[PDB]
Amino acid sequence: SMQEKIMRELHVKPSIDPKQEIEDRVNFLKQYVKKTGAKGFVLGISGGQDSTLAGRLAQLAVESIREEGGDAQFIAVRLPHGDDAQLALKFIKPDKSWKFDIKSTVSAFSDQYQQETGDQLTDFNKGNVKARTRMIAQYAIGGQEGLLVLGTDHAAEAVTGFFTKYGDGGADLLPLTGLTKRQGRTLLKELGAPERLYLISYDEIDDYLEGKEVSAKVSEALEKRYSMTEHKRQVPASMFDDWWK
Amino acid sequence: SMQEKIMRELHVKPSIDPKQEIEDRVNFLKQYVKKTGAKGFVLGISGGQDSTLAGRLAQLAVESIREEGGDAQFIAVRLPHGDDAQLALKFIKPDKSWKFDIKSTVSAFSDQYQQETGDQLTDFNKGNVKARTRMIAQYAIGGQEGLLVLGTDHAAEAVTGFFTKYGDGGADLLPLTGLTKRQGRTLLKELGAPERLYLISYDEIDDYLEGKEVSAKVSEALEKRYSMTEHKRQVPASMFDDWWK
Numbered sequence: 001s002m003q004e005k006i007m008r009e010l011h012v013k014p015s016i017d018p019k020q021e022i023e024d025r026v027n028f029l030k031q032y033v034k035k036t037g038a039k040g041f042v043l044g045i046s047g048g049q050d051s052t053l054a055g056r057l058a059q060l061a062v063e064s065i066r067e068e069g070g071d072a073q074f075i076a077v078r079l080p081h082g083d084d085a086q087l088a089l090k091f092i093k094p095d096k097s098w099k100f101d102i103k104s105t106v107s108a109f110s111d112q113y114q115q116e117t118g119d120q121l122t123d124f125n126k127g128n129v130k131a132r133t134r135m136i137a138q139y140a141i142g143g144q145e146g147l148l149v150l151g152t153d154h155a156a157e158a159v160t161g162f163f164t165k166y167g168d169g170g171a172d173l174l175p176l177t178g179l180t181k182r183q184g185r186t187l188l189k190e191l192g193a194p195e196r197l198y199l200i201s202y203d204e205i206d207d208y209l210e211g212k213e214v215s216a217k218v219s220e221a222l223e224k225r226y227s228m229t230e231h232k233r234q235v236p237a238s239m240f241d242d243w244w245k
Numbered sequence: 246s247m248q249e250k251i252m253r254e255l256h257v258k259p260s261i262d263p264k265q266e267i268e269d270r271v272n273f274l275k276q277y278v279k280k281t282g283a284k285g286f287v288l289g290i291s292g293g294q295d296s297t298l299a300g301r302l303a304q305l306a307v308e309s310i311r312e313e314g315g316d317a318q319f320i321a322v323r324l325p326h327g328d329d330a331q332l333a334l335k336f337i338k339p340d341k342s343w344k345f346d347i348k349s350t351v352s353a354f355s356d357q358y359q360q361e362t363g364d365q366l367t368d369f370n371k372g373n374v375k376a377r378t379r380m381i382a383q384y385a386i387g388g389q390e391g392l393l394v395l396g397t398d399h400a401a402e403a404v405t406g407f408f409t410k411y412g413d414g415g416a417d418l419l420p421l422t423g424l425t426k427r428q429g430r431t432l433l434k435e436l437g438a439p440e441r442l443y444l445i446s447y448d449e450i451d452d453y454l455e456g457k458e459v460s461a462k463v464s465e466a467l468e469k470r471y472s473m474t475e476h477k478r479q480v481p482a483s484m485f486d487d488w489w490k
């Protein structure tokens with residue numbers, strides 16, 4: 001069963017206890033940060049469900065450590081290129097709120113590309129340049145502050161390879177691993193998040209991930225997109241690896 | 246033995262056959278391309294040993310693909326920030342030779358940094374932005390031209406994690422994996438490279454990786470640095486990973 005193997009590899013459960021998932025995940029963040037000796041975390045907050053869930057979990061993790069007598073801080077940054085993000089910040093309530101506007105770095109790069117090359121960066125290619133500029137901003141803040149960069153990647157986002165390689169894919173740790181989009185909505189409700197924040201088909205993708213009976217149409221499409229994106233789920237390939245064969 | 250253990254995880258051979266090494270690496274490049282249906286490669290050339298070896302190997306792979314009736318090309322890019330790179334291009338003889346100056350993109354980033362945070366990026370942190378900016382440059386080109394981005398990482402720098410995480414460490418495939426510094430120099434000599442292009446120390450780092458006997462001070466320093474940089478050789482950390490605990 002390819003569905004069983006994928007389900008296994010991405011760490012998806014068929015059923016979850018949301019309260020215990022919140023606990024398990026906050027504990028992972030605490031634990032990783034005490035192990036490494038880092039000062040806390042930094043995460044880009046966009047207004048979307050994922051970064052909202054991931055940011056609230058990081059504020060809870062940082063607060064528990066300070067309660068045990070340690071030093072930890074959480075920096076939430078807004079990364080615009082020139083309302084829900086603000087709603088997300090009122091809910092998360094981070095220790096610090098920053099902002100870094102990526103419009104001038106992206107422009108400078110575009111102009112240079114045309115100047116040097118003789119071509120315009122296509123929408124799709126400039127789209128990835130923005131995702132990668134935001135990575136650099138998060139790593140520059142973490143670098144300056146002694147913090148770890150959180151990633152908002154999860155299962156439904158992992159099966160489809162739906163993220164920019166080294167853009168939002170470039171992170172130090174990932175608290176939402178193994179969760180589906182629907183399971184991620186459950187946690188948010190448990191956390192008492194405003195509904196506006198958590199509200200083939202994505203719900204179809206969650207069904208397959210949760211081991212539910214799906215249509216071969218969907219199954220086959222999913223299993224091919226997966227093998228097609230394995231490279232984004234591994235470290236750069238060498239002749240000593242086999243997954244790409 | 247940790248010397249033995251690291252040597253194996255990094256794929257180093259105590260003894261190599263130079264000509265066979267070349268053929269194996271050219272064959273890896275050819276084989277990856279065929280499986281994925283890529284059009285070719287792109288790599289930043291700097292004048293140093295590593296980019297010079299990786300680049301000469303890409304060119305031979307690409308010339309060999311076409312002689313079999315295939316479609317492939319290699320673009321070598323100069324990535325200045327404001328003599329040997331020229332000598333290198335003269336030796337590699339790549340299909341296409343481009344250039345992208347990263348100074349304006351970096352100054353745009355640093356300027357907005359100070360403007361946003363009040364503080365200025367440390368020289369060290371500005372240097373990691375430059376490395377990450379060269380990855381965006383290469384990835385924009387591979388995206389616009391439909392090419393895979395080559396990486397220069399090899400065993401002599403993986404042990405020390407002597408690279409920028411998502412900067413020069415961000416690549417699609419790595420043809421120099423498992424080679425030590427002097428071993429790479431030996432490949433360049435087989436290929437007939439001009440001597441100026443290749444002319445803890447590296448000798449001690451290489452002796453350790455090649456399994457030669459070295460002083461306790463060397464093993465202690467390398468094994469410590471190796472442990473603290475494991476995150477650079479692994480996929481982002483999650484609660485289902487044991488390597489970090």
Ligand SMILES: Nc1ncnc2c1ncn2[C@@H]1O[C@H](COP(=O)(O)OP(=O)(O)OC[C@@H]2O[C@@H]([n+]3cccc(C(=O)O)c3)[C@H](O)[C@H]2O)[C@@H](O)[C@H]1O
Pocket residue numbers: 127128131161162163164165166167168228231281384387388392393394417418
């Ligand atoms: N098989 C192969 N082996 C090794 N490397 C391979 C490769 N195939 C492509 N590549 C490389 O990977 C590339 C394509 O990947 P990438 O640059 O990521 O680009 P791409 O697949 O074009 O996807 C970037 C994006 O992911 C989505 N996105 C981005 C950011 C966030 C979210 C979200 O939902 O949060 C979604 C979206 O559809 C889009 O804007 C290449 O140009 C290439 O150099």
Ligand SMILES: Nc1ncnc2c1ncn2[C@@H]1O[C@H](COP(=O)(O)OP(=O)(O)OC[C@H]2O[C@@H]([n+]3cccc(C(=O)O)c3)[C@H](O)[C@H]2O)[C@@H](O)[C@H]1O
Pocket residue numbers: 036139142143147148149172173373376406407408409410411413473476482
């Ligand atoms: N334990 C941990 N678990 C998960 N993630 C962790 C972490 N420890 C650090 N990190 C993270 O990774 C970071 C450090 O990695 P990174 O950003 O690469 O930075 P860092 O290791 O300081 O790299 C700067 C450099 O890499 C080297 N480099 C780069 C380019 C060229 C050359 C040259 O000399 O020509 C050398 C060299 O040692 C140096 O100049 C942190 O800011 C943090 O975000």
